[PDB]
């Protein structure tokens, strides 16, 4: 139900030329149709001198190696759906030399051939999860008095940082969707010795998250810190989850009955935590 | 002989007969190494819709 | 390895067959005068899946013999801008979907005009 196609070519005049051996391995739960490598051995004109295949795990001897762009392709089925998503490997070594190999890294034909990380520095974090949070307690039923507010920031999942943040433009790096913004406020932090208003701060999210964020509006920012920092100094900060995420209502949008005394609850919330900070 | 000495170091030889003394320091440095296949390269690319179970 | 092929108003259906000696991966190409040729659609060598090209979506199908060897293509709801000669050629390394120009041993094709 999948075709692949194995792509070879050496650059030559080194001395190492000869027959080369393929170790490429498909996926998780898939296997090649041998009728059909077997088809492509048999031809006169070969190219595959010799195959075999148990599952996943497929060999290619090749009698020949072209110096251009000169390849064979083939098919594989799965059988039991996989569980993940990542990519696979697939080495070639030399036949009379094994040491001197290559490794090269393939991924599914809608996913990238590296995992999701910003690290671009001396520190290195990565970025797997589910970004958005797209939370509104005003205009749905979920939201309360009580004030939990204090126990997610300070309890339980815990946050670091806090900030009210305007959004000025969207942007796109890598897989990631970037957000150039400007501070408002800051509510509460753990190291940024350099925080101050009108400031600024990149908040990245991966481009298959389809978390949406309207540039030009004022959003509530709470999550874990990052370690990645900017290129001018300022630390970049990620989203994903255990991430809060909100968009402050307006007096027309804090006035009316289906969120009369929430609304102002949030911002004694925000003024309580922006001064006091966390407890116990 | 082990030592850990990590600044100029003093020699203060005693002795009737003559030989070789050298000194080896080891320690890291900026890498350089390629990330990429030099003297063989392989590519392979997949076309196809592939099912996936519960996930993003 | 030779290729074979035999067989308007618009708007119609209309069939199209294409017989090689050697079971293999043929696909079609069409090439209107005055201009260079491209592909309609191509099929692998066991043939449970296909590809088409975009301004043909889940309008044409590609289907397989496995014993007389050959391919079956229909062509209903026929457009009238798509007269054109239409090719049946392979390789033989399962290169699928190599949409450039790269298959040997062409076909000679048929002419099938359009009217409206």
């Known amino acids: 139900r999948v075709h692949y196609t194995v792509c070879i070519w050496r650059n030559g005049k080194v001395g190492l030329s000869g027959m080369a051996i393929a170790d490429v391995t498909l996926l998780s739960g898939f296997h090649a149709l041998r009728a059909d490598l077997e088809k492509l051995t048999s031809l006169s004109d070969r190219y595959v001198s010799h195959f075999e295949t148990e599952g996943p795990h497929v060999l290619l001897y090749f009698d020949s190696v072209p110096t251009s762009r000169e390849c064979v392709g083939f098919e594989a089925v799965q059988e039991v759906p996989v569980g993940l998503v990542q990519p696979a490997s697939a080495t070639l070594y030399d036949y009379y030399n094994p040491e001197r190999r290559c490794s090269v890294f393939y991924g599914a034909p809608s996913k990238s051939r590296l995992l999701a990380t910003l690290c671009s520095a001396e520190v290195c974090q990565c970025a797997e999860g589910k970004c958005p949070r797209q939370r509104r307690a005003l205009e749905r039923g979920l939201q309360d008095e009580d004030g939990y507010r204090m126990k997610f920031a300070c309890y339980y999942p815990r946050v670091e940082y806090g900030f009210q943040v305007k959004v000025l433009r969207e942007d796109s790096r890598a897989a990631f969707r970037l957000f150039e913004t400007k501070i408002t406020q800051v509510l509460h932090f753990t190291k940024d010795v350099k925080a101050a208003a009108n400031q600024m701060r990149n908040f990245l999210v991966r481009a298959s998250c389809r978390l949406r964020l309207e540039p030009g509006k004022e959003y509530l920012i709470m999550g874990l810190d990052g370690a990645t920092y900017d290129l001018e100094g300022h630390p970049q900060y990620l989203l994903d989850s255990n991430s809060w995420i909100e968009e402050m209502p307006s007096e027309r949008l804090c006035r009316s009955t289906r969120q009369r005394a929430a609304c102002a609850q949030l911002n004694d919330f925000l003024q309580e935590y922006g001064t006091q900070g966390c407890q116990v | 002989l082990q030592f850990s000495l990590g600044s100029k170091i003093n020699v203060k030889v005693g002795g009737n007969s003559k030989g070789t003394l050298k000194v080896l320091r080891t320690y890291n440095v900026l890498d350089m190494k390629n990330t990429t296949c030099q003297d063989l390269q392989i590519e392979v690319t997949v076309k196809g819709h592939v099912e996936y179970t519960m996930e993003a | 390895v030779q290729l074979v092929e035999s067989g308007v108003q618009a708007g119609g259906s209309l069939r199209l067959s294409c017989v090689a000696s050697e079971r293999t991966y043929m696909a079609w190409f069409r090439q209107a005068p005055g201009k260079e040729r491209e592909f309609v659609a191509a099929?692998?060598?066991?043939?449970?899946?296909?590809e088409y090209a975009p301004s043909v979506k889940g309008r044409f199908t590609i289907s397989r013999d496995n014993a007389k060897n050959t391919v079956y293509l229909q062509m209903n709801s026929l457009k009238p801008e798509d007269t054109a000669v239409y090719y049946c050629?392979?390789?033989?390394?399962?290169?699928?979907?190599?949409?450039?120009?790269?298959?040997?041993?062409w076909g000679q094709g048929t002419q099938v005009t359009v009217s409206s």
């Open positions: 099929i692998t060598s066991s043939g449970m899946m296909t």
């Open positions: 050629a392979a390789d033989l390394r399962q290169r699928f979907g190599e949409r450039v120009t790269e298959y040997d041993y």
